[PDB]
Write an enzyme that holds these catalytic residues in place. Structure first.
Site, PDB file in Angstrom:
ATOM      1  N   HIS A   1       0.820  -1.213   0.000  1.00 35.34           N
ATOM      2  CA  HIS A   1       0.000   0.000   0.000  1.00 35.34           C
ATOM      3  C   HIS A   1       0.857   1.268   0.000  1.00 35.34           C
ATOM      4  O   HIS A   1       0.674   2.158  -0.842  1.00 35.34           O
ATOM      5  CB  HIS A   1      -0.943  -0.011   1.205  1.00 35.34           C
ATOM      6  CG  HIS A   1      -1.802   1.212   1.323  1.00 35.34           C
ATOM      7  ND1 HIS A   1      -3.135   1.226   0.971  1.00 35.34           N
ATOM      8  CD2 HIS A   1      -1.520   2.462   1.768  1.00 35.34           C
ATOM      9  CE1 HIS A   1      -3.631   2.432   1.183  1.00 35.34           C
ATOM     10  NE2 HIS A   1      -2.674   3.202   1.668  1.00 35.34           N
ATOM     11  N   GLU A   2       1.799   1.353   0.941  1.00 37.54           N
ATOM     12  CA  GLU A   2       2.632   2.553   1.066  1.00 37.54           C
ATOM     13  C   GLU A   2       3.507   2.781  -0.165  1.00 37.54           C
ATOM     14  O   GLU A   2       3.654   3.922  -0.618  1.00 37.54           O
ATOM     15  CB  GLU A   2       3.479   2.551   2.346  1.00 37.54           C
ATOM     16  CG  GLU A   2       2.723   2.348   3.662  1.00 37.54           C
ATOM     17  CD  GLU A   2       1.463   3.192   3.813  1.00 37.54           C
ATOM     18  OE1 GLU A   2       0.544   2.730   4.537  1.00 37.54           O
ATOM     19  OE2 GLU A   2       1.389   4.303   3.234  1.00 37.54           O
TER      20      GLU A   2
ATOM     21  N   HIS B   1       1.733   4.506  -2.826  1.00 35.97           N
ATOM     22  CA  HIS B   1       1.825   5.960  -2.653  1.00 35.97           C
ATOM     23  C   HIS B   1       3.186   6.490  -3.119  1.00 35.97           C
ATOM     24  O   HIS B   1       3.250   7.531  -3.789  1.00 35.97           O
ATOM     25  CB  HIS B   1       1.610   6.385  -1.197  1.00 35.97           C
ATOM     26  CG  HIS B   1       0.207   6.237  -0.694  1.00 35.97           C
ATOM     27  ND1 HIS B   1      -0.902   6.710  -1.364  1.00 35.97           N
ATOM     28  CD2 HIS B   1      -0.256   5.703   0.459  1.00 35.97           C
ATOM     29  CE1 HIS B   1      -1.986   6.462  -0.650  1.00 35.97           C
ATOM     30  NE2 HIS B   1      -1.621   5.849   0.461  1.00 35.97           N
TER      31      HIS B   1
ATOM     32  N   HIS C   1      -5.808   6.793  -3.169  1.00 36.87           N
ATOM     33  CA  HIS C   1      -6.646   5.761  -2.595  1.00 36.87           C
ATOM     34  C   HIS C   1      -7.715   5.263  -3.553  1.00 36.87           C
ATOM     35  O   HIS C   1      -8.043   5.909  -4.554  1.00 36.87           O
ATOM     36  CB  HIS C   1      -7.268   6.235  -1.281  1.00 36.87           C
ATOM     37  CG  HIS C   1      -6.310   6.221  -0.132  1.00 36.87           C
ATOM     38  ND1 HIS C   1      -6.391   7.104   0.920  1.00 36.87           N
ATOM     39  CD2 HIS C   1      -5.225   5.446   0.109  1.00 36.87           C
ATOM     40  CE1 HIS C   1      -5.411   6.859   1.773  1.00 36.87           C
ATOM     41  NE2 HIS C   1      -4.689   5.858   1.303  1.00 36.87           N
TER      42      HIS C   1
HETATM   43 ZN   LIG Z   1      -2.841   5.279   2.096  1.00 44.92          ZN
END
Ligand SMILES: [Zn+2]
Ligand SMILES: [Ca+2]
Ligand SMILES: [Ca+2]
Ligand SMILES: [Ca+2]
Ligand SMILES: [Zn+2]
Length: 158
Positions: free
Chosen positions: A113-114, A117, A123
Protein backbone atom coordinates in the site's frame (compact mmCIF):
# COMPACT_ATOMS: atom_id res chain seq x y z
CA UNK A 1 0.07 13.98 -9.65
CA UNK A 2 3.84 13.34 -9.67
CA UNK A 3 5.41 10.17 -11.10
CA UNK A 4 8.95 8.82 -11.43
CA UNK A 5 10.38 9.73 -14.87
CA UNK A 6 12.91 6.88 -14.98
CA UNK A 7 12.71 3.08 -14.88
CA UNK A 8 15.51 2.15 -12.43
CA UNK A 9 14.43 3.02 -8.86
CA UNK A 10 16.49 2.47 -5.72
CA UNK A 11 15.43 1.87 -2.12
CA UNK A 12 17.29 1.71 1.17
CA UNK A 13 16.17 0.30 4.51
CA UNK A 14 17.20 3.02 6.98
CA UNK A 15 16.69 0.93 10.11
CA UNK A 16 15.00 -2.33 11.13
CA UNK A 17 12.04 -2.97 13.41
CA UNK A 18 12.96 -5.20 16.41
CA UNK A 19 9.55 -6.88 15.89
CA UNK A 20 10.88 -9.12 13.10
CA UNK A 21 13.90 -11.13 11.97
CA UNK A 22 16.17 -8.95 9.77
CA UNK A 23 15.90 -11.27 6.77
CA UNK A 24 12.10 -11.22 7.05
CA UNK A 25 12.05 -7.41 6.88
CA UNK A 26 14.28 -7.53 3.79
CA UNK A 27 12.04 -10.14 2.15
CA UNK A 28 8.71 -8.44 2.97
CA UNK A 29 9.94 -5.14 1.50
CA UNK A 30 11.48 -6.84 -1.56
CA UNK A 31 8.24 -8.75 -2.28
CA UNK A 32 6.18 -5.56 -1.89
CA UNK A 33 8.29 -3.81 -4.55
CA UNK A 34 7.93 -6.89 -6.81
CA UNK A 35 4.12 -6.57 -6.71
CA UNK A 36 4.46 -3.25 -8.54
CA UNK A 37 7.36 -4.12 -10.85
CA UNK A 38 5.17 -7.05 -12.03
CA UNK A 39 2.69 -4.68 -13.67
CA UNK A 40 4.96 -1.79 -14.75
CA UNK A 41 8.31 -1.19 -16.51
CA UNK A 42 9.82 -0.24 -13.13
CA UNK A 43 12.85 -2.01 -11.65
CA UNK A 44 13.72 -1.81 -7.95
CA UNK A 45 17.15 -2.32 -6.37
CA UNK A 46 18.16 -2.27 -2.71
CA UNK A 47 21.19 -0.14 -1.89
CA UNK A 48 23.07 -0.19 1.41
CA UNK A 49 24.74 3.22 1.27
CA UNK A 50 24.10 6.69 -0.16
CA UNK A 51 20.92 8.39 -1.36
CA UNK A 52 18.13 6.05 -2.48
CA UNK A 53 14.97 7.23 -4.23
CA UNK A 54 12.82 5.52 -1.58
CA UNK A 55 13.99 5.52 2.04
CA UNK A 56 12.21 2.95 4.25
CA UNK A 57 12.06 4.05 7.91
CA UNK A 58 10.65 2.60 11.13
CA UNK A 59 9.87 5.34 13.68
CA UNK A 60 7.40 6.23 16.44
CA UNK A 61 5.62 9.44 17.48
CA UNK A 62 7.20 12.61 16.10
CA UNK A 63 9.95 11.68 13.67
CA UNK A 64 10.90 14.79 11.69
CA UNK A 65 7.94 15.37 9.35
CA UNK A 66 4.31 16.61 9.33
CA UNK A 67 2.98 13.09 9.86
CA UNK A 68 3.64 12.27 13.54
CA UNK A 69 2.53 8.77 14.48
CA UNK A 70 -0.21 8.00 16.99
CA UNK A 71 0.87 4.95 19.03
CA UNK A 72 -0.52 1.44 18.54
CA UNK A 73 -3.37 1.30 16.02
CA UNK A 74 -4.82 4.14 13.97
CA UNK A 75 -2.26 5.24 11.39
CA UNK A 76 0.06 2.29 10.65
CA UNK A 77 2.39 3.92 8.11
CA UNK A 78 2.53 6.73 5.56
CA UNK A 79 4.50 7.58 2.42
CA UNK A 80 5.40 10.55 0.25
CA UNK A 81 4.63 10.73 -3.47
CA UNK A 82 7.39 10.80 -6.12
CA UNK A 83 9.89 13.65 -5.85
CA UNK A 84 13.32 14.68 -4.62
CA UNK A 85 14.48 14.41 -1.00
CA UNK A 86 11.74 13.01 1.23
CA UNK A 87 9.65 12.32 -1.91
CA UNK A 88 9.02 8.59 -2.28
CA UNK A 89 9.99 7.81 1.33
CA UNK A 90 7.92 5.28 3.29
CA UNK A 91 7.61 5.40 7.08
CA UNK A 92 6.24 2.60 9.29
CA UNK A 93 4.93 3.18 12.83
CA UNK A 94 7.18 1.31 15.30
CA UNK A 95 4.31 1.33 17.81
CA UNK A 96 2.66 -1.34 15.65
CA UNK A 97 3.80 -4.95 15.96
CA UNK A 98 5.06 -5.92 12.51
CA UNK A 99 4.88 -9.55 11.36
CA UNK A 100 5.21 -12.02 8.47
CA UNK A 101 1.76 -13.48 9.14
CA UNK A 102 -1.81 -12.67 10.23
CA UNK A 103 -0.79 -11.65 13.76
CA UNK A 104 -0.01 -8.01 14.55
CA UNK A 105 0.22 -5.88 11.40
CA UNK A 106 1.50 -7.58 8.25
CA UNK A 107 4.55 -5.68 6.99
CA UNK A 108 4.35 -6.98 3.38
CA UNK A 109 0.70 -5.96 2.91
CA UNK A 110 1.22 -2.55 4.51
CA UNK A 111 4.33 -1.97 2.38
CA UNK A 112 2.47 -2.81 -0.84
CA UNK A 113 0.00 0.00 0.00
CA UNK A 114 2.63 2.55 1.07
CA UNK A 115 4.87 1.82 -1.94
CA UNK A 116 1.77 2.43 -4.09
CA UNK A 117 1.82 5.96 -2.65
CA UNK A 118 5.62 6.17 -3.18
CA UNK A 119 4.92 5.55 -6.90
CA UNK A 120 2.19 8.20 -7.07
CA UNK A 121 -1.04 6.29 -6.43
CA UNK A 122 -3.95 7.66 -4.43
CA UNK A 123 -6.65 5.76 -2.60
CA UNK A 124 -9.36 3.50 -3.93
CA UNK A 125 -12.97 3.34 -2.70
CA UNK A 126 -12.97 -0.43 -3.45
CA UNK A 127 -12.55 -2.53 -0.24
CA UNK A 128 -10.95 -5.26 -2.42
CA UNK A 129 -8.12 -2.96 -3.56
CA UNK A 130 -4.79 -2.79 -1.74
CA UNK A 131 -5.06 1.02 -2.09
CA UNK A 132 -8.24 1.06 0.04
CA UNK A 133 -7.53 3.65 2.80
CA UNK A 134 -7.85 1.15 5.71
CA UNK A 135 -5.78 -2.00 6.45
CA UNK A 136 -7.11 -5.57 6.22
CA UNK A 137 -5.27 -8.90 6.31
CA UNK A 138 -5.51 -11.25 3.35
CA UNK A 139 -3.49 -14.48 2.89
CA UNK A 140 -0.05 -13.17 1.88
CA UNK A 141 0.96 -16.44 0.17
CA UNK A 142 -1.84 -16.09 -2.40
CA UNK A 143 -1.94 -12.27 -2.57
CA UNK A 144 -2.82 -10.92 -6.00
CA UNK A 145 -3.15 -7.28 -7.03
CA UNK A 146 -6.80 -6.44 -7.68
CA UNK A 147 -8.03 -5.27 -11.10
CA UNK A 148 -8.62 -1.77 -9.66
CA UNK A 149 -5.00 -1.44 -8.43
CA UNK A 150 -3.66 -2.62 -11.80
CA UNK A 151 -5.84 -0.01 -13.57
CA UNK A 152 -4.59 2.63 -11.13
CA UNK A 153 -0.87 1.95 -11.58
CA UNK A 154 -1.17 1.47 -15.35
CA UNK A 155 -2.70 4.95 -15.61
CA UNK A 156 0.72 6.22 -14.37
CA UNK A 157 3.27 3.77 -15.84
CA UNK A 158 3.62 1.44 -18.83
ZN1 LIG B 1 -2.84 5.28 2.10
CA1 LIG C 1 -0.18 3.94 14.87
CA1 LIG D 1 13.26 10.04 -1.40
CA1 LIG E 1 7.04 -2.41 17.02
ZN1 LIG F 1 6.87 10.11 8.55
Amino acid sequence: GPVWRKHYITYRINNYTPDMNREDVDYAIRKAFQVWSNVTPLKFSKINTGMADILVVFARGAHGDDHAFDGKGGILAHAFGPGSGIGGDAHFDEDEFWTTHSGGTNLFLTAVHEIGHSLGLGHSSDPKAVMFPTYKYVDINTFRLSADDIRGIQSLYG
